[PDB]
Amino acid sequence: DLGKKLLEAARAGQDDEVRILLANGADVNTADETGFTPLHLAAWEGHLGIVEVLLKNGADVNANDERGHTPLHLAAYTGHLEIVEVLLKNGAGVNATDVIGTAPLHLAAMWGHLEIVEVLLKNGADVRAQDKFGKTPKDLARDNGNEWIRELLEKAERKLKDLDRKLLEAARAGHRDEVEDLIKNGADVNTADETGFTPLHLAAWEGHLGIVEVLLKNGADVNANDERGHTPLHLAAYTGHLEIVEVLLKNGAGVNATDVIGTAPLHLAAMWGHLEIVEVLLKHGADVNAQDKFGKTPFDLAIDNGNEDIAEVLQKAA
């Protein structure tokens, strides 16, 4: 019974009653049938004093209702700026998503709460977050005619695109500290250039081992395909970067991936004379019988190109 009274007092804005109920043992994190806590209801109705009292007494700032909405979602939707600021100060998750993929920034942008948008952005909100329909917050601002917010979010996305371009260049050039700084300031490790090369492609091609490792640790797709089907492992096998081959395989690289010509990493290592790489690829399950579009196996290429030691290794594995 205490829990129900606290929910109602919080919803009704009964500041004195909230304090008494808490003093008498009401559970600050009690939840109604749909998972709303007193903090949800105070944030939704705009009762700043009660929000602060609930947080002072142990309220879970990131409590989820049964569909994933947090108190920050509700304050962002209803446009309660000071409550947004208090929630964030008490640890609210600025990028939390409900079961539809909707984050607080989606709601502030859709419902035209500019100062809340600006506060969410200052607190780390992700302008690239897409809901289940594929909408970013900018998309919703545009669709709903909130042009000032749309323009603000467009500028923010253009700054991230610039960071993405610098990340490609730093990864190609081997500037490790620049790579790490760019990732920390929000560069997308899975960005790709016009031909489909990602930072991981460029680092593997240029033999930048440390950068390969940093990119994979920050979530880079080990099996990303460029526009012709080449993966990072293709490029490391071609250029002969043995340690990078081993890191890629350790991180899940597909050992038998083929480009649009049917060329696999083993073809490239055998053709270009990289014996240790051939051996590592065989150890990880490379397919000696794979034929490219010309009908050539890796053994065929080793024979055609005079790589006798490799030809013998591949016959042993026939």
Residue numbers in the entry: 13 to 330
Structure paper excerpt:
In this paper, we present a strategy to fuse specific, high-affinity protein binders to obtain multivalent or multispecific scaffolds of predetermined geometry. DARPins are used as building blocks to confer the desired specificity to the construct. A series of rigid connector modules replacing the DARPin capping repeats allow to combine the individual DARPin domains in such a way that their distance and angle can be altered to test different geometries, bringing the binding partners of the DARPins into a defined spatial arrangement. The two helices are not just joined end-to-end, but instead the two domains are made to overlap in such a way that the joining helix is stabilized by contacts with the domain cores along its entire length.
In the context of DARPin-β-lactamase fusions, we observed that the paratope of this DARPin has a high propensity to form major crystal contacts, leading to crystal formation under a wide variety of conditions. Indeed, constructs D12_Hxx_D12 with H02, H09, H11, H13 and H15 yielded diffraction-quality crystals in space groups P212121, P6122, P212121, C2 and P1, respectively, at resolutions ranging from 1.8 Å to 3.5 Å. Indeed, in the majority of the D12-containing structures analyzed in this study, the D12 paratope-paratope interaction provided the largest crystal contact, with a total of around 1700 Å2 of solvent-accessible surface buried in the interface. D12_H15_D12 makes paratope-paratope contacts of this type both within the asymmetric unit and with symmetry-related molecules. Five out of nine DD structures showed good agreement between design and experimental crystal structure with root mean squares deviation (rmsds) of the Cα atoms below 2 Å. This confirms the design strategy and validates the concept of a shared helix as a rigid connector.
